[PDB]
From a paper:
Consistent with its absence from primate mt tRNAAla sequences, the human mt AlaRS/tRNAAla system was recently shown to be insensitive to a G3:U70 identity element. For the human mt AlaRS/tRNAAla system we show that loss of the G3:U70 identity element was accompanied by a radical reorganization of the recognition mechanism, away from sequence-specific direct readout in the acceptor stem to sequence-unspecific structural readout of the flexible tRNA elbow. The appended C-Ala domain, which plays an auxiliary role in prokaryotic AlaRSs and is dispensable for aminoacylation in the human cytoplasmic AlaRS system, plays a central role as a folding aid for the intrinsically flexible mt tRNA elbow. Fine-tuned induced-fit adaptation selects mt tRNAAla and rejects non-cognate mt tRNAs.
The model suggested two major contact sites between mt C-Ala and mt tRNAAla. One is in the C-terminal α/β-globular subdomain (aa 873 to C-terminus) containing the glycine-rich “GG” motif. The second is formed by helices α2 and α3 of the N-terminal subdomain (aa 783–872). Both helices are lined with highly conserved basic side chains that form an extended patch of positive surface charges. Due to the 3-helix architecture, helices α2 and α3 can move significantly closer to the tRNA than in the prokaryotic complex, allowing direct contacts with the T-stem and V-loop. In particular, the mt AlaRS-specific Gly825 appears to be important for tight association between C-Ala and tRNA and may explain the sensitivity to V-loop size (see above). Thus, adaptive evolution of the Hs mt AlaRS/tRNAAla recognition system was accompanied by a radical reorganization of its recognition system, moving the center for tRNA recognition from sequence-specific (G3:U70) readout in the acceptor stem to C-Ala-mediated sequence-unspecific readout of the tRNA’s elbow structure.
Numbering used by the authors: 786 to 986
The structure:
Amino acid sequence: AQQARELGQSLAQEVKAATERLSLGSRDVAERLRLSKDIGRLIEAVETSVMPQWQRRELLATVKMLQRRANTAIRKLQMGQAAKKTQELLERHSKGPLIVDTVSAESLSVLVKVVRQLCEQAPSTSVLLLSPQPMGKVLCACQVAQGAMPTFTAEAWALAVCSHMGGKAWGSRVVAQGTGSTTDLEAALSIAQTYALSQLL
């Protein structure tokens, strides 16, 4: 009873600290993700915690706000880094029919955002990108232009790509993503561009 109320008060104080941290925000995306996870776990604990109902649900309101602004913030920061790298690749490539290259990324979400921005700004171009990860792992994301032939499907594209790397692929005809592991990146890049060109007839 009293102990539960005290714990709830501590949680609220903790909640206040978390909110302050959020206002402050964090430069590292990883720390932003960690904060969102702390929000989810904390809300789950409050859900089954013992305390007066009014305070419990009032705090639930505050913390749900905290999660919305936290997740919105992390999504914005990923959009920022993805935009910067997207411009970095835009400066040196021509808007050809097909652009197949590699870009350094920290997570697959950011890579996907790069592909979507790139296709949004170059509508008549199909895109595939690979990201090297430590310890030999490799990520893949690709998107096919809407104007492109329907015979060209992204899922089969990344399907062959990761299929050569022994990985896995998933998506739809328009967008696809996958994982693999291979020493030579130019082999996967060459297979992707070869296949895609073979379809683009």
